[PDB]
DNA sequence: GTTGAGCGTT
């Protein structure tokens, strides 16, 4: 019921990858990877919204090895 | 063709 920000994302990681990964925990409403609009190069972080809340809690309780690097899913500021 | 803590153009 709330967006989770994802930190530590590898540079090459794309939206659908993040989606693909996070889907293994449950249904994913949306996903975002923040990039420079001019180059498309990832800024290293993203966002994700889950349908179920229990799926959201689970994802925060642990770190995430995404494309070779440990990533953190935290509640965002503002 | 580069980097590595952070906080979201629509």
Residue numbers in the entry: 103 to 180
Publication text:
TDP-43 consists of an N-terminal domain (NTD) and two tandem RNA recognition motifs, RRM1 and RRM2, followed by a C-terminal glycine-rich region (G). It forms homodimers and the two RNA-recognition motifs are involved in nucleic acid binding.
After refinement of the RRM1 domain structure, the difference Fourier map (Fo-Fc) revealed a clear continuous electron density that could be fitted respectively with 8 and 9 nucleotides in the two RRM1/DNA complexes per asymmetric unit. For clarity, only a single RRM1/DNA (chain A) and RRM1-D169G/DNA (chain A) were used for structural presentation and comparison hereafter. Superposition of the RRM1/DNA complexes determined in this and previous studies reveal that the unmodified DNA bound in RRM1 and RRM1-D169G (this study) fit well, but deviate from the Se-labeled DNA around the Se-labeled sites at A5 and G6. The overall structure of RRM1-D169G mutant is similar to that of wild-type RRM1, nevertheless, a small local difference was observed in the β turn (Turn6) containing the D169G mutation. Superposition of the two proteins yielded an average root-mean-square deviation (RMSD) of 0.39 Å for 71 Cα atoms.
